[PDB]
Ligand binder design. Structure first.
Ligand SMILES: [Zn+2]
Lengths: 53, 98, 70, 65, 141, 171, 104
RNA sequence: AUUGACAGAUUGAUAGCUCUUUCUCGAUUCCGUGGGUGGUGGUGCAUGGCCGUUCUUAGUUGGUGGAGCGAUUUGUCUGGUUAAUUCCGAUAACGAACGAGACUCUGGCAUGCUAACUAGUUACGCGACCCCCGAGCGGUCGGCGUCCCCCAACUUCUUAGAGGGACAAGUGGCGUUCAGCCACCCGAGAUUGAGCAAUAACAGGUCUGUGAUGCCCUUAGAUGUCCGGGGCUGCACGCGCGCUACACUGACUGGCUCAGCGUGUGCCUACCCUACGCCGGCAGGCGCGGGUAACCCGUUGAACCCCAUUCGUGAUGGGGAUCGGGGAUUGCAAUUAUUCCCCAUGAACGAGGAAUUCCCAGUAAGUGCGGGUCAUAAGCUUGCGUUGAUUAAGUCCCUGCCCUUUGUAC
C-alpha cells in the first residue's frame, strides 16, 4: 500500500517536470520557467521573451 | 455514491459552494489545495469529477495539466437531490452585477 | 595589461593636449598635436575595434566547428 | 563598390525635387533638413539617403536638364 | 617615499629578510612538509618561503585593506593542470594564508578590522614604508 | 507573505501567468468568439479584460459564465477573493483579428462547408473588413489520404523585416 | 509631514516606462517640492538560448531569446497623500511601480 | 452484495501479494455487454505544428494588353551598373506584388543635453583621522586606507534616456560625363556584426515536446502504473566531434599584475550565491554576517602574459594515461572506481601516410571566466572578455552556385 509512491522524488529529472507538456527532458529551469524547451518556444512571445538577435 | 463517504460528500459540497472546481492533474497530492479538511487528496476529487462528467453532471476544460470544472444545470440538480438540499439553495451564480 | 597601457598612453597625451587648449594657447596645442600624430595617430584617436561576438556553430565568431562528412 | 540607392530613394528624391526645387539646394545639410520638413519620412537613414540623391540631382540640374 | 613608489618584486625580498632578521614571526611545524595549494605539483624551492609569503601578504594589505583568508586564497590563486582534462583556477591554501595572517597578527604588523578581514596596522605601516625607503636608497637604477 | 521575489523572476513569472491564462481562455472561449486577454494589475485589484466578438455568449445567462471563470481564475492561479474580475469587451472590427478568423474558419471546417469555399469566404471577409492584405493556409489531408495544402492569398503582404513583428497579425 | 519617500518603476518596455517617470516628475513639479531625476539602473537582459528544433536532427540552430528589464527610480521629500495622488495617475501599461517609505 | 486486514509461514520487501485467522466502509462491489481510459506502444510514407534543407543565393508572381491550335511565352531584357531582378537605360508592353534593400538589435563618435547615497564620487575643501605613514632639522609635499555626512562641486570615467551624427556629402580621376567605380580630405568612409527573411518544393526530421492528432495495436496474467534489482557505461574491432600532449618560445617554484558577459535563496514542491572568523596539509568542517541584488558575493584582485627560479635536450623535472593505498563531501543509496583531495604508480606519444577541416580583423589561434544541464557536475555546448598574428583583397583550376544562348533519345 504505502510503497506505491515511496521512492524519494526530491531531485533530478525524475522529480522536476514541465508546467505544460509535463515531459522531462529539456526543462528551461533558469528563471523558474520550468517548461519543455519546445513549450518555451511555443509560449515565448506571450511569456515576454523575444528574439531581437 | 462511491468509495469513502466523508471525502466524497465533502467534494460534492465544495462543488456546490463554488459553481466551478479545479484540480491539478497530479495523482500524488496527499492534500488537495483548497478543501484540505483531512487528507482528501487530489484524486478522489479527480476521479469523482470524472464520474460527474461521465453521467453528464459537470462540464470540463483541461488546459496546462490542471482541470477546470464548470458545473451544468442538470449537474446542480443532481447535487441538491444527493445532498438533500432545499429548492432555494443558491449554488454560486447569484452575484449583483451593477 | 597591454590595453590598459595603451589607454593611459592615449590618456595623458590627450590630456596634455586638453590642458594646452583650455589654459595655454591653441597655437601650442596644434604644435603638440602635430608632434604626437606624426609619430602615431593612436596617441589621441581611439581604436574603435573591440572583441567581435561569437555566433554558435563554432568556437568563435568567424571560425566554425569541424565538419565530418563521410 | 557597394552603395547603389534603391528606387525608394530615387523616386522620393525625383518627386521631391519636382515639388520643391526652390527650397532645395546644393548645400547638403540644409536640404537634408528640408526633406524632413516637406516630406514625411519614417526613418533617419532613408531621410538622410534621399537627401543625398537629392544633392546628387541638384548637381545635375545645374548643368542642363 | 612610500611603498607604492617602489618596484614591488625587490620589495617583498627585503621585507621577508626584514621579517627573518627580527626572528619572531611564527613559522608553523609543517612548513617543510606542506605543498602550498592544490595547484602545485611540489612544495617551494625557497625553504624560507613563509617569510616571503607573509611579506607579500602584508604588502598586499598595505595596498588593499580588510582582506580575510578567502581574500588571500583568491589572490594566491592560479592554474590547475587537471592532466588530461583542461585547466582551471584553483584557490590557494586556506591554512597557510590563515597562519600568515595570525603570524602577522602576533607581530602587530596587522590587526582584524571592523567589517571583517585584516588591515595592516599603524606600527606595521611603519615597517613596510620604512623598507620602501631602504630600497629607494639602494641606488639610482 | 513577505517574499518579494526577484525582478528577473517576477517579470518572467507574470508573463507565464498571462500566457497560461490566454491558453485556458483560447480553449474555453474559442467557439464563443474569443480574440485575446489583456491583464492589468491595480491597487488591491486585478482587472483582466477578455476580448471577444460574441460578448453576450461569454457573459452567459443573466451573467453566469464570467462568474464561473472568475471563480476558476481565483481558484487556480491563487488569487484572494475579490482581487480579480473578468471584463468582456467587444472587439472593434472582428475581421482584422487573425485568431478570430482562424477560429471562424476552424468552426466552418468542422461544420462541413468545403475547404475551398469556407476559406475563400474568410479571406473575402477580412478583405472587406479593411485589411492591407492576407494569407490563409490550410494544410493536411484535403480530399484523399495524402497530405497537401491550399494557400488562399490576396493583396499587400510582408514577411521579412522587423515591420512584420507589428504590421501583420498571425494566427 | 516630510519623510524621504522613494518611487521605483520597472518595466519590460522602455517608452511606456519613460513616459511614466516623466508624468511623476511633472506631478512632483506641479505640486512643487523636490525629486532627484529618474535614476537609471543598468538594465538587465534575461537571456535564453534554445535549439530551434524539437528533436535533434537538422543543422543545429539556436533561438537567442531576450527579455530586457528596465529600472528607473526617483527620490522625493513629501507626505503620503501627495504621493498617492501622483501614483494613482500613470497606470494602464505594464510598469511595476514600487513605493518605499523612507531610507530603506 | 462482498471495498479494506497485526500473525506466522512465504517473500526481496515492515508487497494483507498469497495460505491460516481477524474482523470491516456499509451500498462500496463482482459479471456481462455496450463502452471507456491510458500507453516514451506501431505508423513521420495517414496528418497538424515546429524545425532543417533545397538556397544564402537573387530570386519569385499573377492583372490587363501583345505572341502562339496549344503546353507556354512576353513583361522578368542587348548593353553598362551593382552585394542584390540593385540601379541606369532599351522596350508589346503598362502598371503592380513578394523578396533584396529600408527595418530591428548591436558596435564604435559625442568635456553637448537630461541624470543620480543601489554610479562615480570628482577634482576640491583636505573637515579630517592616523600614527612618523613617509621625504624632510621643521614647514611644504607624496601615498593611499579610508572616516565622512550633507546645509561641498560637479558629471571627465558610470549608468541609460532623448537627440545628434555619414549621405559615397566634399575634392580629384574614370564612366554615354547617367547608374556608378576608383582615389584622397575631413572625420567612423558607402562595408561593425547579428536578427528577420520570397515562390515552389523534400514523401528530410519529428507520432520519445505537447491534454496537437487519424488509423492500427494493447488494455488487468497489461504495451497503464508503481516498487526492487539490473542495463543503456557491457569490448577481437571500424569510424565521427572532442581534450591532453609530444617540451627549453618550455617545466616547475615563488613574485608582480589587468577583464568582460552573466548568475544567485526565501521557488510549481525544497532548496541558492556566498564575505568574515576559527578547525584541517587538502578535499572539506564548524561558527556567525550580507544579498530577491549597480545595495552582498564583488575594486568579481582570472588565466595566458610579465618578473626572478631551477632544470638542461636525456621519453628529461616534457606527458600524465594505467593502477595500489588512504582520506573528504552529494546522496535514500556510489560496488562497474558520482565527484573531490593526498601519496605512490609513471604507459603511448620525439609534430603524425594517403586524406581532409576551419578560417581574412580585434578575425585565426592561444587563454581563462560566465550561462545551459546541475543533490552530486564538463573533455560538450551556449555566451563573455584577455592576449593577439601570417596571409588575400584575387580567380574560376577543383568544389559548387546565379543568369544567357545551345544541344538533349533525360
Ligand atoms: Zn508543452
Amino acid at each position: 500500500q504505502q510503497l506505491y509512491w515511496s521512492h524519494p522524488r526530491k531531485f533530478g529529472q525524475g522529480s522536476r517536470s514541465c508546467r505544460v507538456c509535463s515531459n522531462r527532458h529539456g526543462l528551461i529551469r533558469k528563471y523558474g520557467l520550468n517548461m519543455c524547451r519546445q513549450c518555451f518556444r511555443q509560449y515565448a512571445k506571450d511569456i515576454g521573451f523575444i528574439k531581437l538577435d | 455514491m462511491l468509495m469513502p463517504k466523508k471525502n466524497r460528500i465533502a467534494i460534492y459540497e465544495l462543488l456546490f459552494k463554488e459553481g466551478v472546481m479545479v484540480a491539478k492533474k497530479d495523482v500524488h497530492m496527499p492534500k488537495h489545495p483548497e478543501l484540505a479538511d483531512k487528507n482528501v487528496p487530489n484524486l478522489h476529487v479527480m476521479k469523482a469529477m470524472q464520474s460527474l462528467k461521465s453521467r453528464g453532471y459537470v462540464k470540463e476544460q483541461f488546459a496546462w495539466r490542471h482541470f477546470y470544472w464548470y458545473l451544468t444545470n442538470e449537474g446542480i440538480q443532481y447535487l441538491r437531490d444527493y445532498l438533500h438540499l432545499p429548492p432555494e439553495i443558491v449554488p454560486a451564480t447569484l452575484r449583483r452585477s451593477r | 595589461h597591454v590595453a590598459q597601457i595603451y589607454a593611459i598612453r592615449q590618456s595623458i597625451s590627450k590630456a596634455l593636449v586638453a590642458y594646452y587648449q583650455k589654459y595655454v594657447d591653441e597655437a601650442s596645442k596644434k604644435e603638440i598635436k602635430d608632434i604626437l600624430i606624426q609619430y602615431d595617430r593612436t596617441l589621441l584617436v581611439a581604436d574603435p575595434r573591440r572583441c567581435e561576438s561569437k555566433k554558435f556553430g563554432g568556437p568563435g565568431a568567424r571560425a566554425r566547428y569541424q565538419k565530418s562528412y563521410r | 563598390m557597394g552603395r547603389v540607392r534603391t528606387k525608394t530613394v530615387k523616386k522620393a528624391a525625383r518627386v521631391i525635387i519636382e515639388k520643391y526645387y526652390t527650397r532645395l539646394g546644393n548645400d547638403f545639410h540644409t536640404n537634408k533638413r528640408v526633406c524632413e520638413e516637406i516630406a514625411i519620412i519614417p526613418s533617419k537613414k532613408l531621410r538622410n539617403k534621399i537627401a543625398g540623391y537629392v544633392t546628387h540631382l541638384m548637381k545635375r540640374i545645374q548643368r542642363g536638364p | 617615499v612610500t611603498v607604492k613608489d617602489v618596484n614591488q618584486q625587490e620589495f617583498v625580498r627585503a621585507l621577508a629578510a626584514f621579517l627573518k632578521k627580527s626572528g619572531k614571526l611564527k613559522v608553523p611545524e609543517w612548513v617543510d612538509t606542506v605543498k602550498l595549494a592544490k595547484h602545485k605539483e611540489l612544495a617551494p624551492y625557497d625553504e624560507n618561503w613563509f617569510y616571503t609569503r607573509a611579506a607579500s601578504t602584508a604588502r598586499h594589505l598595505y595596498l588593499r585593506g580588510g582582506a580575510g583568508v578567502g581574500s588571500m586564497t583568491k589572490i594566491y590563486g592560479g592554474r590547475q593542470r587537471n592532466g588530461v582534462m583542461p585547466s582551471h583556477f584553483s584557490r590557494g591554501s586556506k591554512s597557510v594564508a590563515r597562519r600568515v595572517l595570525q603570524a602577522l597578527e602576533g607581530l602587530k604588523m596587522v590587526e582584524k578590522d571592523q567589517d571583517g578581514g585584516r588591515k595592516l596596522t599603524p606600527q606595521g605601516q611603519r615597517d613596510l614604508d620604512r623598507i620602501a625607503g631602504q630600497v629607494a636608497a639602494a641606488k639610482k637604477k | 507573505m513577505a517574499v518579494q521575489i526577484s525582478k528577473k523572476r517576477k517579470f518572467v513569472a507574470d508573463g507565464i501567468f498571462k500566457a497560461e491564462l490566454n491558453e485556458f481562455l483560447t480553449r474555453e472561449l474559442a467557439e464563443d468568439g474569443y480574440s485575446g486577454v489583456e491583464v492589468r494589475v491595480t491597487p488591491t485589484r486585478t482587472e483582466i479584460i477578455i476580448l471577444a466578438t460574441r460578448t453576450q455568449n461569454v457573459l452567459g445567462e443573466k451573467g453566469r459564465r464570467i462568474r464561473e471563470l472568475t471563480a476558476v481564475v481565483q481558484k487556480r492561479f491563487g488569487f484572494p477573493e475579490g482581487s480579480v474580475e473578468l471584463y468582456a469587451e467587444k472587439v472593434a472590427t472582428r475581421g482584422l483579428c487573425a485568431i478570430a478568423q482562424a477560429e471562424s474558419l476552424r468552426y466552418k471546417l468542422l461544420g462541413g462547408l468545403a475547404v475551398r469555399r469556407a476559406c475563400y469566404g474568410v479571406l473575402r471577409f477580412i478583405m472587406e473588413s479593411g485589411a492591407k492584405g492576407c494569407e490563409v493556409v490550410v494544410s493536411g489531408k484535403l480530399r484523399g489520404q495524402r497530405a497537401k495544402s491550399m494557400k488562399f492569398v490576396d493583396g499587400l503582404m510582408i514577411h521579412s523585416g522587423d515591420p512584420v513583428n507589428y504590421y501583420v497579425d498571425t494566427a | 509631514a516630510i519623510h524621504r519617500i522613494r518611487i521605483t518603476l520597472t518595466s519590460r518596455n522602455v517608452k511606456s516606462l519613460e513616459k511614466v517617470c516623466a508624468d511623476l516628475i511633472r506631478g512632483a513639479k506641479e505640486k512643487n517640492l523636490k525629486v532627484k531625476g529618474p535614476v537609471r539602473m543598468p538594465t538587465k537582459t534575461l537571456r535564453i538560448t534554445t535549439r530551434k528544433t524539437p528533436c535533434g536532427e537538422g543543422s543545429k540552430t539556436w533561438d537567442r531569446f531576450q527579455m530586457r528589464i528596465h529600472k528607473r527610480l526617483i527620490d522625493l521629500h513629501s507626505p503620503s497623500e501627495i504621493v498617492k495622488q501622483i501614483t494613482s495617475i500613470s497606470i494602464e501599461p505594464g510598469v511595476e511601480v514600487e513605493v518605499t517609505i523612507a531610507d530603506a
